[PDB]
Design a protein around this ligand. Structure first.
Ligand SMILES: Nc1nc2c(ncn2[C@@H]2O[C@H](COP(=O)(O)OP(=O)(O)OP(=O)(O)O)[C@@H](O)[C@H]2O)c(=O)[nH]1
Ligand SMILES: [Mg+2]
Length: 159
């Protein structure tokens, strides 16, 4: 009686993968940095009752994931640069240029921005994927990121 979507959250250490997930699951912001596990969330997206199966990571998970949030932090230039490596990984495992993915630029609430929205838009355009800006602290963009990913999975494959 409901559709499962297997989502995987990837990106460099410290970017806010867990914080984003815990916002979606708990509606709370975890202040403290606790550096792999699985969460489930039932949600209605476009009148479909969805069971999200979310892997919060640090080939195994990549093989079976249906869509990926590729997360960097807007005050961490190295994390933005690292996106390439995560995307290449995902593409290799799937043997496809066409894998459901969203680029997420997290920590939008912080002042020390080193990656501008143009850099991020350029990257997402090159990849052919959406870009969503988030703050796990304020919850800005969090549902948007996850719901957009679900829509991208539907767009690619019958669910
Ligand atoms: N201000 C702010 N801090 C955040 C946000 N997202 C996460 N943080 C903080 O950044 C730190 C790292 O967040 P985590 O969610 O543990 O990062 P992670 O990507 O899961 O890191 P790993 O588990 O090491 O791969 C924590 O102190 C969070 O409180 C955000 O949107 N805004
Ligand atoms: Mg984490």
């Amino acid at each position: 009686h409901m559709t499962e979507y297997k989502l995987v959250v990837v990106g460099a250490a410290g970017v806010g993968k867990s914080a984003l997930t815990i916002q979606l699951i708990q509606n709370h912001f975890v202040d403290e940095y606790d550096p792999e596990d699985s969460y489930r969330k039932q949600v209605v997206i476009d009148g479909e009752t969805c069971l999200l199966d979310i892997l919060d990571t640090a080939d195994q998970y990549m093989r079976t994931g249906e869509g990926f949030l590729c997360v960097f932090a807007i005050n961490n230039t190295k994390s933005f640069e690292d996106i390439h490596h995560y995307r290449e990984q995902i593409k290799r495992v799937k043997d496809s240029e066409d894998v459901p993915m969203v680029l997420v630029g997290n920590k939008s609430d912080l002042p020390s921005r080193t990656v501008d929205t143009k850099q991020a838009q350029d990257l997402a355009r090159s990849y052919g994927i959406p870009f969503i800006e988030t703050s796990a602290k304020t919850r800005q963009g969090v549902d948007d990121a996850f719901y957009t990913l679900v829509r991208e999975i539907r767009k690619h494959k019958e669910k």
